[PDB]
Amino acid sequence: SGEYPTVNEIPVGEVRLYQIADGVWSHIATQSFDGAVYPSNGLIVRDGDELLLIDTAWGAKNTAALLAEIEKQIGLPVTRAVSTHFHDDRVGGVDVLRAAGVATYASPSTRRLAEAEGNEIPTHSLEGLSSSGDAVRFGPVELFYPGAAHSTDNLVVYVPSANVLYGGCAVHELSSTSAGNVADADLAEWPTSVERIQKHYPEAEVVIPGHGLPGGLDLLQHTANVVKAHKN
Ligand SMILES: C[C@@H](c1cccc2c(-c3ccc(CS(C)(=O)=O)c(F)c3)c(C(=O)O)[nH]c12)N1CC(CCCN)OC1=O
Ligand SMILES: [Zn+2]
Ligand SMILES: [Zn+2]
Known part of the structure; x- marks a missing residue:
């Protein structure tokens, strides 16, 4: 009924949308x-009379439910999707998207890692993102590669019309007590990557983590703080 949703409102298999700004929603599954049960976020950005999707809803059935929820709540077609790293919470559901008319994209690094992991593989490669600090435009967003953090391939997404920074899994929520799933992380480089994000997007008004509650720019410093303590 208006607050950002959590698992206690989200059975596995259901998807909720949350309006972030004009033409910007998050999706939560x-x-x-x-x-154990975990929430995860993605993004939806209005692109004229179409929608750009950022990240799957973490699995095939969740992603089908996502498409249904978008049709119910927004009613515009999802034409393109970008996955922000290679883990299942970002690419699991890409096969569903591809069979529903959605063109799927990721960096070549993400595509290689997904293929090696046995995860679903976005169709199209996003060039121009291979060096830290790189940025490219993709419809109504900017994609930015901050460097290795939660994973070596993680991308962040900025919505310039609304000053929304979608950090993906490189950014944690304010309540976090540790750096999440660090299996593929670089704890030593992560603070430097976060500093790059802070420097590139100083006018962000909303910051959305890969998992948990949005907030403001403090999510970035908090993330650096929890990661440094995890390394140590
Ligand atoms: C599928 C993904 C995965 C699965 C399960 C949980 C997560 C978490 C996670 C965990 C805890 C918290 C609360 S908290 C900040 O307070 O601890 C949280 F917010 C997020 C994250 C992430 O942190 O993004 N991702 C997870 N996987 C799979 C995987 C194995 C790769 C092996 N090569 O690696 C990975 O990330
Ligand atoms: Zn991950
Ligand atoms: Zn994650």
Whole structure:
């Protein structure tokens, strides 16, 4: 009923949308992994009379439910999707998207890692993002590669019309107590990558983490703080 949703409102298999700004929504779903349940976020950005999707809803059935929820709540077609790194919370559901008319994109690094992991593989490669600090335009967003953080391939997304910074899994929510799933992380480079984000997007008004509640720019410093303590 208006607050940002959590698992206690999200059974696995259901998707909720949350209006972030004009023409910007997050999507929230939940999934089981290794016997625990987690929420995860993605983004939807209005692109004229179409929609750009950032990240799947963490699995095939969640992603089908996402498309249904978008049709119910927004009613514009999703034409393109970008996955911001290679893990299942970002690409699991790409096959569903591809069979629903959506053109799927990721960096070549993400595509290679997804293929090696046995995860679903976006169709199209996003060039121009291979060096930290690189940025490219993609419809109504800017894609930015900050350097290695949660993963070596993680991308962040900026919506300039609304000053919305979608950090993906390189950014944690303010309540976080540790740096999340660090299996593929670079804890030593992560603060430097976060500093790059802070320097590039100083006018961000909303910051959305890969998992958990949006807030403001403090999410970036908080992330650096929890990661430094995790490394140590
Ligand atoms: C599918 C993904 C994965 C699965 C399960 C959980 C997460 C988490 C996670 C965990 C805890 C918290 C709360 S908190 C900040 O307070 O701790 C959280 F916010 C996020 C993250 C992430 O942090 O983004 N991602 C997860 N996977 C799979 C995987 C294995 C790759 C092996 N090569 O690696 C990975 O990330
Ligand atoms: Zn991940
Ligand atoms: Zn994640």
